[model samples]
Target: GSSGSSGLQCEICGFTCRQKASLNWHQRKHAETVAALRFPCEFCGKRFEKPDSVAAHRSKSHPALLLAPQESSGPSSG
Candidate 1:
């Protein structure tokens, strides 16, 4: 809520207005963002804007990629 506006309400929660400036903050508490948790790994300290990005980075930057299923076919097969 700001200026002349009251606030954005959650249609699923009986329209209870959000308490934060961005709806993202409100939505994160109740719902999940595919990209929200797509953050820098505390274990590896690698930051990412999205999950796929980090996964791609890890695939190249670390050996963990082998543990993760390849997103595409092997170059030899291709």
Candidate 2:
């Protein structure tokens, strides 16, 4: 009968957390703790624990972004 009892959920990996101001963006912490900091895309900041998925997203989602030649073709985000 307690409809307000719906709790927090991480859609990233189907995780649940008891709410007490864990304060959104909890999945970022979940990634580090559970899967270790995964690789982030250069064209887009999307992260992936699986390298396969990263490549897939790069090819699919970032096809146009990746196609553009980089500024000096450099890793400038230090």
Candidate 3:
């Protein structure tokens, strides 16, 4: 797992972390950020942090926007 102490780098971004746990959390965030990108608001064109955020935004700000099921990247098993 040690690509060296600096080896645990994020695959999505070039972010490096000191520990496996830290890198795991950071990678999760990278996924979430990408997830947000997948669901942009039609009205304001604002990107959300998660699917729920997208729903909440549409509920209040843009009711015309349809909610779509998030595409599953599948289970991440070690």
Where model 1 places Cα greater than 4 Å from the true spot, the runs are 1-38, 64-78
TM-scores for all candidates?
Answer: 0.30, 0.39, 0.36
Which lDDT value does model 1 have at 78?
12
Off by over 4 Å in 2: 1-37, 68-78
Model 1 per-residue lDDT tens digits across residues 1-78:
347767677632224554665555666654543345547744367556567777666667665634634776554421
User: CA lDDT of 70 in candidate 2?
Assistant: 58
Candidate 3 lDDT over 18-58, as tens digits, reads 66898888877776677646666655777765677877877
Candidate 2 on 33-62: residue-level lDDT in tens? Answer: 655437776656767776788888878877
List the candidate numbers ranked by lDDT, top first.
2, 3, 1
Determine the backbone clash count of candidate 2. Answer: 0
Error of 3 at 67 (Å): 41
Candidate 2 matches the true fold with a TM-score of: 0.39
For candidate 2, what is the lDDT?
A: 0.66
By TM-score, the best candidate is 2
For model 1 the local lDDT of residue 1 reads 32
